[model samples]
Target: GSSGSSGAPEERDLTQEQTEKLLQFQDLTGIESMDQCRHTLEQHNWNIEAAVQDRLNEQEGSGPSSG
Candidate 1:
């Protein structure tokens, strides 16, 4: 078998401010999944208001939007 390469640290790419923004966005959107929060925030370039606006648009129902 061939030798394997050591795995490097690929996590922690998001900075403190980005993480803070992500959590705030999560709370504002009432999104339980951090992954979804991160994804949505990233799509909106961490603009909390825009992210929440988009989320509300997507969830224009009486409950959370389902996959």
Candidate 2:
């Protein structure tokens, strides 16, 4: 979307900080797509911990991977 004033790189709507966390989150959870990361963070109000937990909940056989 609008990048939310985070000045994300072109075609990216996440800030450098957010992107960095997302990358780490990727390493932890294997949620590879930045698109999915953006949506997860957005859905969780940009709370990385919450987003990661939500993803983790899913990975625990709760349902299909959001990716």
Candidate 3:
């Protein structure tokens, strides 16, 4: 299970500044579907690795699976 991080080096909150940057990127990219963004974020479990894997899978036409 994922462990919650406290203001430690391993864990940091998404600050207002970061959120604003993401919103700015969305505005510039013309991504109006907040649902897509929400879904993607949700699937990532709020983890960077999961989000990156999601993007890679989207480009590769495959999903994470055990062999």
TM-scores for all predictions = 0.67, 0.58, 0.35
Q: After superposition, how far is residue 59 of candidate 2 from its true place, in Å?
A: 3.5
lDDT of 1 at 34: 90
Give lDDT tens digits, candidate 3, residues 1-67: 5987556468434668646544654453334685454445557653434554564456543445536
Error of 3 at 21 (Å): 8.5
TM-score-wise, the better of 1 and 3 is 1
User: Clashing residue pairs, candidate 3?
Assistant: none
Residues 1-67, candidate 1: write the lDDT tens digits. Answer: 5877567856648899999998788777778889898887889988888888788888554655546
Residue ranges of candidate 1 with Cα displaced over 4 Å: 1-12, 61-67
Top candidate, metric TM-score: 1
How high is the CA lDDT of each candidate model? 0.80, 0.72, 0.51
Give one digit per residue, the lDDT tens place, for model 2 in 14-58. Answer: 678877877876776676687787677779976678888877776
Instruction: Compare candidates 2 and 3 on lDDT and give the better one.
Output: 2
